[PDB]
Design an enzyme around this catalytic site. Structure first.
Site, PDB file in Angstrom:
ATOM      1  N   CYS A  15      -4.403  -7.350  11.568  1.00 25.57           N
ATOM      2  CA  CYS A  15      -3.068  -6.790  11.565  1.00 25.57           C
ATOM      3  C   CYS A  15      -2.304  -7.136  12.847  1.00 25.57           C
ATOM      4  O   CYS A  15      -2.913  -7.212  13.889  1.00 25.57           O
ATOM      5  CB  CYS A  15      -3.112  -5.270  11.437  1.00 25.57           C
ATOM      6  SG  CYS A  15      -1.454  -4.563  11.312  1.00 25.57           S
ATOM      7  N   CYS A  19      -0.567   0.577  15.411  1.00 26.73           N
ATOM      8  CA  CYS A  19      -0.424   1.984  15.075  1.00 26.73           C
ATOM      9  C   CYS A  19      -1.571   2.805  15.671  1.00 26.73           C
ATOM     10  O   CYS A  19      -2.741   2.545  15.430  1.00 26.73           O
ATOM     11  CB  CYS A  19      -0.342   2.106  13.551  1.00 26.73           C
ATOM     12  SG  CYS A  19       0.937   1.152  12.709  1.00 26.73           S
ATOM     13  N   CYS A  22      -4.312   4.229  13.235  1.00 31.51           N
ATOM     14  CA  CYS A  22      -4.801   3.398  12.132  1.00 31.51           C
ATOM     15  C   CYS A  22      -6.262   3.700  11.777  1.00 31.51           C
ATOM     16  O   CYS A  22      -7.190   3.626  12.604  1.00 31.51           O
ATOM     17  CB  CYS A  22      -4.564   1.943  12.502  1.00 31.51           C
ATOM     18  SG  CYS A  22      -5.082   0.785  11.208  1.00 31.51           S
TER      19      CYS A  22
HETATM   20  C1  LIG Z   1      -4.159   0.917   6.668  1.00 32.35           C
HETATM   21  S1  LIG Z   1      -2.505   0.722   6.035  1.00 32.35           S
HETATM   22  C2  LIG Z   1      -2.651  -0.937   5.284  1.00 32.35           C
HETATM   23  C3  LIG Z   1      -1.415  -1.627   4.792  1.00 32.35           C
HETATM   24  C4  LIG Z   1      -0.339  -1.985   5.826  1.00 32.35           C
HETATM   25  N1  LIG Z   1      -0.911  -2.472   7.098  1.00 32.35           N
HETATM   26  C5  LIG Z   1       0.533  -0.760   6.112  1.00 32.35           C
HETATM   27  O1  LIG Z   1       0.426  -0.237   7.243  1.00 32.35           O
HETATM   28  O2  LIG Z   1       1.200  -0.333   5.173  1.00 32.35           O
HETATM   29  C6  LIG Z   1      -2.572   1.675   4.452  1.00 32.35           C
HETATM   30  C7  LIG Z   1      -1.770   2.965   4.498  1.00 32.35           C
HETATM   31  O3  LIG Z   1      -2.525   3.953   5.234  1.00 32.35           O
HETATM   32  C8  LIG Z   1      -1.693   4.574   6.178  1.00 32.35           C
HETATM   33  N2  LIG Z   1      -2.516   5.122   7.250  1.00 32.35           N
HETATM   34  C9  LIG Z   1      -3.017   4.418   8.321  1.00 32.35           C
HETATM   35  N3  LIG Z   1      -3.707   5.150   9.145  1.00 32.35           N
HETATM   36  C10 LIG Z   1      -3.649   6.419   8.601  1.00 32.35           C
HETATM   37  C11 LIG Z   1      -4.225   7.626   9.009  1.00 32.35           C
HETATM   38  N4  LIG Z   1      -4.984   7.736  10.083  1.00 32.35           N
HETATM   39  N5  LIG Z   1      -4.036   8.713   8.220  1.00 32.35           N
HETATM   40  C12 LIG Z   1      -3.288   8.562   7.123  1.00 32.35           C
HETATM   41  N6  LIG Z   1      -2.703   7.468   6.618  1.00 32.35           N
HETATM   42  C13 LIG Z   1      -2.908   6.419   7.437  1.00 32.35           C
HETATM   43  C14 LIG Z   1      -0.721   3.468   6.585  1.00 32.35           C
HETATM   44  O4  LIG Z   1       0.437   3.970   7.236  1.00 32.35           O
HETATM   45  C15 LIG Z   1      -0.414   2.857   5.211  1.00 32.35           C
HETATM   46  O5  LIG Z   1       0.616   3.529   4.493  1.00 32.35           O
HETATM   47  S1  SF4 Z   2      -1.488   1.133   9.660  1.00 30.38           S
HETATM   48 FE1  SF4 Z   2      -3.093  -0.112  10.603  1.00 30.38          FE
HETATM   49  S2  SF4 Z   2      -3.199  -1.938   9.236  1.00 30.38           S
HETATM   50 FE2  SF4 Z   2      -1.076  -0.867   8.778  1.00 30.38          FE
HETATM   51  S3  SF4 Z   2       0.381  -1.771  10.351  1.00 30.38           S
HETATM   52 FE3  SF4 Z   2      -0.486  -0.017  11.328  1.00 30.38          FE
HETATM   53  S4  SF4 Z   2      -2.240  -0.906  12.578  1.00 30.38           S
HETATM   54 FE4  SF4 Z   2      -1.671  -2.396  10.954  1.00 30.38          FE
END
Ligand SMILES: C[S@@+](CC[C@H](N)C(=O)[O-])C[C@H]1O[C@@H](n2cnc3c(N)ncnc32)[C@H](O)[C@@H]1O
Ligand code: SF4
Ligand SMILES: Nc1ccn([C@@H]2O[C@H](COP(=O)(O)OP(=O)(O)OP(=O)(O)O)[C@@H](O)[C@H]2O)c(=O)n1
Length: 279
Positions: A15, A19, A22
């Site tokens: 990625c 975030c 994440c």
């Molecule tokens: C891991 S992200 C993958 C796809 C893409 N990178 C994105 O951020 O949309 C999948 C979803 O999980 C959410 N997400 C990530 N970390 C999270 C957390 N700790 N608790 C809840 N949702 C989370 C993200 O904001 C996103 O909507």
């Molecule tokens: S939630 Fe995780 S995988 Fe999605 S943009 Fe943020 S750092 Fe990247």
């Protein structure tokens, strides 16, 4: 055995963003070869999969692979619903023009409409809201259902997003209470530590209350999010999301034997609204 009706394929862990919360971190760079991913998707279809969500990782770092899989899943497998979840930054109009007939739903992740908030979170460099509205208009243009995903956390739990939501009008607005996942974001040994961003049940509830006039709102407190998903990793193993080892790959042992090895709270899945009109 359980029927894997709706499956998230985290096909890559790479990625472009940072975030702080994440929960699916960049621990490898492995991606299946296209031929093998298509075989796996075929086995899931045959096991009763109706809906596939492409996640990660950031999917739009791999547009060739993503486009191949979306075209395959609709045109060949005839899945009921093909979805993607993306941070939105790398989405180009050309992709939706080329592959839009095969995309049922496009989810864009944007946790705030204060650009300072998105920057402090680590998702953005100040253009997320602008890009979101743009993608919204493209979905309108290319006949794609437009979905918004928001993580409710320490930095945004007091925000009021109603005017934006009224302007954007996504058919589905997922509001996730920031979730801790053992082995992903739960210590200083992991690539993230989300513990300083977690909020009380009452904070999460007051957010949802503030937005009670949004009929598109789909709330997910920790209780409903933790174990209510079917999650394949980059090797197409099912993940338990609790510190337990992954299943063996569906490509090695088949879907039934892989799924047997993880817990999927189907009661939680239904209750959070996991079955819906997804095309
Ligand atoms: C891991 S992200 C993958 C796809 C893409 N990178 C994105 O951020 O949309 C999948 C979803 O999980 C959410 N997400 C990530 N970390 C999270 C957390 N700790 N608790 C809840 N949702 C989370 C993200 O904001 C996103 O909507
Ligand atoms: S939630 Fe995780 S995988 Fe999605 S943009 Fe943020 S750092 Fe990247
Ligand atoms: N313990 C969990 C619970 C969920 N997820 C991930 O969190 C994301 C939530 O995104 P969402 O858009 O809710 O996924 P969909 O399955 O498309 O949701 P729905 O069908 O309900 O719209 C998914 O990628 C899911 O695999 C996770 O990594 N760990």
């Amino acid at each position: 055995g359980q029927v894997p009706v709706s499956v998230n394929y985290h096909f890559s862990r790479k990625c472009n963003k940072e975030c702080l919360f994440c929960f699916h971190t960049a621990t490898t760079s492995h991606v299946e070869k296209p031929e093998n991913a298509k075989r796996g998707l075929t086995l899931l279809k045959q096991a009763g999969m109706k809906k596939i969500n492409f996640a990660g990782g950031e999917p739009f770092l791999y547009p060739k692979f993503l486009g191949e899989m979306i075209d395959f899943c609709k045109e060949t497998l005839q899945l009921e619903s093909v979805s993607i979840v993306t941070n939105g930054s790398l989405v180009k109009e050309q992709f939706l023009q080329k592959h839009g007939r095969n995309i049922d739903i496009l989810a864009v992740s944007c946790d705030s409409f204060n650009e300072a908030t998105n920057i402090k979170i680590g998702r953005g460099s100040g253009d997320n809201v602008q890009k979101l509205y743009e993608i919204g208009s493209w979905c309108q243009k290319y006949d794609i259902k437009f979905k918004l995903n928001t993580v409710v956390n320490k930095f945004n739990h007091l925000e009021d997003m109603n005017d934006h939501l009224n302007a954007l009008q996504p058919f589905r607005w997922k509001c996730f209470q920031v979730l801790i996942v053992t082995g992903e974001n739960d210590s200083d040994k992991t690539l993230r530590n989300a513990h300083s961003l977690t909020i009380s049940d009452d904070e999460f509830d007051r957010f949802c209350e503030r937005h009670s006039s949004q009929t598109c709102l789909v709330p997910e407190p920790n209780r409903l999010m933790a174990k209510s998903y079917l999650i394949l990793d980059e090797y197409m193993r099912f993940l338990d999301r609790n510190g337990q080892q992954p299943s063996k790959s569906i490509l090695e042992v088949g879907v039934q034997q892989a799924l047997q090895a993880v817990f999927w709270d189907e009661e939680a899945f239904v209750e959070r609204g996991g079955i819906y009109d997804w095309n």
